[PDB]
Design a binder for this molecule. Structure first.
Ligand code: SF4
Ligand code: F3S
Length: 106
């Protein structure tokens, strides 16, 4: 599975979903997650993220390992998203800020 990590929070550009062949992204208020059972590891979304927030799970940074289980858990509760929409309004101010998990909204 590919995993969405920290920099997606408060950016949520959603470019990643246009390229997903199996529609396995699920939508929260200010973050997206990949459903690990659905992902076919095609790696097509990883170059599309402007925030460079998607990683193969075997390449998730050490300080972002929490995101693996978070994607698995929230994917089970959030609605499926299959079409790109506009980025959050201040996405570029928050792109690159570290430690945005304290801002995640359920
Ligand atoms: S690696 Fe492929 S199947 Fe998995 S979320 Fe990305 S685009 Fe979808
Ligand atoms: S910012 Fe998030 S919504 Fe997709 S394009 Fe990147 S993983």
């Amino acid at each position: 599975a590919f995993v969405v990590t920290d920099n997606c929070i408060k950016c949520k550009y959603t470019d990643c979903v246009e390229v997903c062949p199996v529609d396995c992204f699920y939508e929260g208020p200010n973050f997206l997650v990949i459903h690990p059972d659905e992902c076919i590891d095609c790696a097509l979304c990883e170059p599309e993220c402007p925030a460079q927030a998607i990683f193969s799970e075997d390449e998730v940074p050490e300080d972002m390992q929490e995101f693996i289980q978070l994607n698995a858990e929230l994917a089970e509760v959030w609605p499926n998203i299959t079409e790109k929409k506009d980025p959050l309004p201040d996405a570029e101010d928050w792109d690159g800020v570290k430690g945005k998990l304290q801002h995640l909204e359920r």
